[PDB]
Each structure stands twice: as C-alpha cells, then as structure tokens.
C-alpha cells in the first residue's frame, strides 16, 4: 500500500540488469497511468497507458528533454483493465527498456538518455492503487 504519485528513488541510477517491478490495481474507471524514470528534471522513459484517448486504448512511450517532449513511440496491445490487479516489469538492457505486463512482453523502449547512471528516480502515477515498488538485479 503506497500513496500516488510515488517516487522511487533508484541509486546511482539505472544500469543493465536492473529489474523493476510494481504491482497495482487500475481503479474504475481509470484514464491514464504514467511511469516516468526521470534524470533530474528530464525524463528519459515515460511510460503512459491511456484507457480513453478518442475512445481508444494505447500506451505512449517519450522522452522528455529540457521541458520537451520528443517523438511519441505508440503501441497497440494494451494489457490493463480497469478494476483489474497488474504487475509491470521494467528491465534495464543495454540497448533499451524491456517491459513486460502480468509476464506478457509488451514493448521495449530505446535509450534516449545515454547517462543511465543519473536516471534516479521513479515517479509512478495516476489512477491505480499501488501496492508496491521495488528493484532487483538480475
């Protein structure tokens, strides 16, 4: 049981090998849910699912560099369910970002921000009850 927006702090950043997990449930009627790994003010992966963008359902995926967002990378498979407990899996590799819903691959996300040791905190946010967040080395 976590309080939301919450922010995992990751130290000395991220680096391959590195697992995070966070387990939650989308409330009713959710609208969006974002996860942000963030190197100071920049994010360098922005993960943001979108239950009702035009009446469709799609996850976003950015950067943000200099209060810029850069070139949206879009994905039609779209795992969560409003009412519905999910497990998100965040594992740093070298070349990207591997995510994987409920151990479903979903998407990988190429880094953008190169100093994966300054990415050093997670911001996870919107409409779920989060029940953890944490980290691993695999």
Request: hydrophobic share 40%; proline share 7%; glycine share 6%.
């Amino acid at each position: 049981m976590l309080i939301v927006p919450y922010n995992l702090p990751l130290p000395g950043g991220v680096v391959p090998r590195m697992l995070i997990t966070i387990l939650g449930t989308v409330k009713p009627n959710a609208n969006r849910i974002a996860l942000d790994f963030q190197r100071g003010n920049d994010v360098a992966f922005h993960f943001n699912p979108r239950f009702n963008e035009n009446n469709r359902r799609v996850i976003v995926c950015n950067t943000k560099l200099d209060n810029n967002w850069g070139r949206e990378e879009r994905q039609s498979v779209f795992p969560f369910e409003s009412g519905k407990p999910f497990k998100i899996q965040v594992l740093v590799e070298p070349d990207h970002f591997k995510v994987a819903v409920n151990d479903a691959h979903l998407l990988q996300y190429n880094h953008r921000v190169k100093k994966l040791n300054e990415i050093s905190k997670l911001g996870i946010s919107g409409d779920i009850d989060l029940t953890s967040a944490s980290y691993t080395m695999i």
